[PDB]
Design a protein around this ligand. Structure first.
Ligand SMILES: CCOC(=O)[C@]1(CS)N[C@H](C(=O)O)C(C)(C)S1
Ligand SMILES: [Zn+2]
Ligand SMILES: [Zn+2]
Length: 241
């Protein structure tokens, strides 16, 4: 069993598939979890989402590597058996974009914040094929999110990184905060090296206000939590200013 140093442990209802873990959150929504070993530190988990929308599947975030991301696609083939229409990635760090080549090799259309695509080369990432842009209130410009179906993309402002984006799943109680939101038991906001400490708290609060009725908050490095994760994150970030 994989017992990560960062991220949730394995729980009943989880399915191991290769070195990845999959957990159903709702009839048409699953969380994907992949792991990276950090020397002297142990395993670090990263979570993303898989959404069944009619006759197609939509993915939020890659795994850490191409090989792990290919296994996401294999799991989808086995357990859902519908084509993957698109993937959205939520910022230009390895846990979210490290597997872009596996998606492109498979012919899957990929989307990221334009700024994420602009930063990807510097971050050692392969840029997505398409760029999302955002209104002043943070909501995606819909022409840049073609056929996103239930994925409702929101840019909350700079926080974890300047490019971080978030995704609500329409028709469910689920919203995905990515690496911006930490669970309510977190002791810190983690590594702040790329973070905007001035704007982080407001960005976290903006995420909460954008998806006011989501009751299950999914995040990159913790198990799903209640809305308290948002407020606790924002109050930790208040201390950075
Ligand atoms: C290059 C590996 O690092 C990463 O890709 C992340 C991106 S969020 N960095 C975080 C950090 O260093 O705190 C993390 C929680 C370990 S995962
Ligand atoms: Zn990150
Ligand atoms: Zn992360």
């Amino acid at each position: 069993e994989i017992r990560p140093t960062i991220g949730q442990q394995m729980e009943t209802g989880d399915q191991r598939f290769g070195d990845l873990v999959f957990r159903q959150l709702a009839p048409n929504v699953w969380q994907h979890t992949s792991y990276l070993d950090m020397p002297g530190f142990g395993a670090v988990a990263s979570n993303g989402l898989i959404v069944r929308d009619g006759g197609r599947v939509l993915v939020v975030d890659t795994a850490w590597t191409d090989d792990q991301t290919a296994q996401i696609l294999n799991w989808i083939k086995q357990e859902i058996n519908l084509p993957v229409a698109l993937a959205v990635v939520t910022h230009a760090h390895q846990d979210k974009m490290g597997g872009m080549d596996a998606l492109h090799a498979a012919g899957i259309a990929t989307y990221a914040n334009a700024l994420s695509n602009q930063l990807a080369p510097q971050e050692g990432m392969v840029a997505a094929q398409h760029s999302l842009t955002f209104a002043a209130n943070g909501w995606v410009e819909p022409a840049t999110a073609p056929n996103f179906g239930p994925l409702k993309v929101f840019y909350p402002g700079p926080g974890h990184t300047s490019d971080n984006i978030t995704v609500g799943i329409d028709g469910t109680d689920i919203a995905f905060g990515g690496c911006l939101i930490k669970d309510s038991k977190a002791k810190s906001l983690g590594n702040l090296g790329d973070a905007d400490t001035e704007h982080y708290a407001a960005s976290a609060r903006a995420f909460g206000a954008a998806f006011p009725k989501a009751s299950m908050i999914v995040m990159s490095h913790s198990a799903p939590d209640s809305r308290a994760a948002i407020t606790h994150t924002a109050r930790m970030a208040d201390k950075l200013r």
